[PDB]
C-alpha cells in the first residue's frame, strides 16, 4: 500500500514483508537476457540446438542445450 513519511517501524517492516515476495522468487533465476559464445552446434537430436559458454560460469563448465 501507500507507505508515507508518517509511518511506524512496524508498518515499514510489514510493507517490506509483503513486497519482498517477488525478490524472493527472483533468487536463483536469470532475470536479464545474456550474451554468449556458441561452442557446440552439433545437436544429436536434430533439434537445431546449440551449446553456449555464458560468462556466469566463466567457460569452466559447459551449459545446457539451448533451443532456437
Amino acid at each position: 500500500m501507500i507507505v508515507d513519511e508518517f509511518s511506524s517501524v512496524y508498518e515499514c517492516l510489514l510493507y517490506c514483508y509483503k513486497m519482498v515476495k517477488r525478490s524472493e522468487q527472483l533468487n536463483g533465476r536469470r532475470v536479464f537476457p545474456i550474451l554468449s559464445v556458441v561452442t557446440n552446434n552439433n545437436d544429436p537430436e536434430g533439434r537445431r540446438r546449440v551449446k553456449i559458454a555464458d560468462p556466469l560460469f566463466g567457460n569452466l563448465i559447459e551449459s545446457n542445450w539451448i533451443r532456437p
Binding site: 511506524s8 517501524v9 512496524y10 515499514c12
Partner: peptide
C-alpha cells in the same frame, strides 16, 4: 506491563525515525 510495552513501541518507533534521519 502494557504501559511499558507501549512505551517500548514509542521508543523503537522514534529510534527508527532517528535512523531514517541519520542516513544519507
Amino acid at each position: 506491563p502494557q504501559a511499558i510495552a507501549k512505551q517500548i513501541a514509542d521508543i523503537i518507533n522514534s529510534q527508527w525515525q532517528g535512523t531514517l534521519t541519520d542516513y544519507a
